[model samples]
Target: MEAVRAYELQLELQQIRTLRQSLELKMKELEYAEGIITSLKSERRIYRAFSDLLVEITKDEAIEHIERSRLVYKREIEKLKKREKEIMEELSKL
Candidate 1:
């Protein structure tokens, strides 16, 4: 019973660490998405900045694709945040 309890504790600790790492990664991704969105917005659908390069953005191709990627990243960030909350609640219960 003592050994079993020790194993359980280790498993819980590992779970917490994994959740924290995932949350941090998601936050980074969110920041990246925000920067990309901002860069695209700065051009007003005429051109966009890709690091040091300025690429022309058209409504039919580049704009639509960039917008979709931004939305996807935003949604992913929200999902990860929710999961983090759930994990914290679970940790508290333990």
Candidate 2:
């Protein structure tokens, strides 16, 4: 009947709208993720220089401080990589 067809059309419209919103949200996430990746890459380069400096520092205090910072940065990079993977997984679902 026409009424049943009308109901199905309305449901299809709702689904399409939701799909668009999900796509938009995914795009936003990708944009932000790219920015984070860029910044992290720069951080990685800087950290490489820091690693070289670690070999040269003499004071025990300075070495401890730098090593701690290096560890924190390493952990952060790991977290970001995990985030990137999670995003990829969710995006694939769409």
Candidate 3:
């Protein structure tokens, strides 16, 4: 019984760590996009990556899209942080 519980906790820890890393990477991408947007003129054209293709869009549209994604990533990151803390606490008790 104890061993099973330990294994489950270990798996969860691994999964959470991986998720957090990916989320951080996404957040970095958004930051990079924001930087590029700010450096360019309002009339300048910008393209956002969609899978293998790049879609051309206006500066304002790009900013809006990035802002929306940033909000989502931020919310998920917050939730992940809370789960990580809880997982650590449980592991410590083990």
Candidate 4:
């Protein structure tokens, strides 16, 4: 029974780590895009990828989208980090 519990904990920890890594990568990408947008001229056009197609948007719109996405990613990453800590504490108790 203890072995099964440990196995489940390990699996959950692995899943959380994988999700956190992806979120961090996406957050970095958004930051890079934001930097590029801020350095561009106000009238410059920005193209955002939407699945298989690219949509044209204004610089302001692009920034807004990036900001919203980054905020969500940041929150999720923090939540995952907290869960990871809790899991580690539980595992250590075993």
Candidate 5:
């Protein structure tokens, strides 16, 4: 009877240790994810302003070659913004 109790205690300790390790790993993952989110958010904000500028230019009646170039840049910025949105969706799953 005493040997059975000892075995159970050992199992409990092992389970607790495993759980602790799992929790720590998840915490680290959260930290890394948060860092990525912050970087993406900052980049998105900067590109957002430039994109807004290009969009406005697109709306103008007398568009120039330079304005067309700005449209290309805005397309690139839109791609990045779309990627950022996808990442946010994936993060929400976690």
Candidate 6:
């Protein structure tokens, strides 16, 4: 029987920690947006009475939620790209 050659893991533990934390932050941001979306949906009936006011306020809320989500997603994407660059550069050395 042949024995396997031993190899150490090349992945960095700290980078993985950073990724996990970033993902959690992204999730929280999305969850908050979802909450706002749900609230707006539930208030549809009440908002209908105010006509222009209702639509204006609801639109504003939607915009706010979308912006919040977008910022978080952008951050997550940038963080991942940086992490990838760093990790790949490190691996390239090997």
Clashes of 6: 0
Q: Candidate 5: list runs displaced more than 4 Å.
A: 1-5, 40-94
Cα deviation at 92, candidate 1, in Å, is 3.2
User: In candidate 3, residue 18 scores what lDDT?
Assistant: 89
Overall local distance difference test of candidate 5: 0.47
Order of models, best TM-score first: 4, 3, 6, 1, 5, 2
lDDT of each: 0.61, 0.49, 0.85, 0.93, 0.47, 0.57
Kindly list the per-residue Cα lDDT of model 3 for residues 27-69, writing each as its tens digit.
8888897898789465567898889999998878888998888
For model 6, name the residue pairs that clash. Answer: none
lDDT of 2: 0.49
What local lDDT does model 4 show for residue 25?
A: 99
Backbone Cα, N, C clashes tallied per candidate? 0, 0, 0, 0, 0, 0
Error of 5 at 89 (Å): 45
Off by over 4 Å in 1: 1-45
Candidate 2 or 4, higher TM-score? Answer: 4
Off by over 4 Å in 3: 1-4, 40-44
lDDT-wise, the better of 2 and 4 is 4
Deviation in Å, model 3, residue 91 alpha carbon: 0.5
TM values, all candidates = 0.40, 0.34, 0.82, 0.86, 0.34, 0.40
Q: State how far residue 11 of model 6 sits from its true place (Å).
A: 6.6
Model 4: per-residue Cα lDDT over 39-62, one tens digit each = 846556789998999999988899
Of models 5 and 6, which has the larger TM-score?
A: 6
Show the lowest summed lDDT stretch of 10 residues, model 2. Answer: 40-49
What does candidate 2's lDDT look like per residue over 32-55, in tens digits? 544554453433221223544634
Q: What is candidate 6's lDDT per residue for 2-41, written digit by digit as tens?
A: 1111112234535655675677676676667556666735
Runs in model 2 lying further than 4 Å from the true structure: 1-58
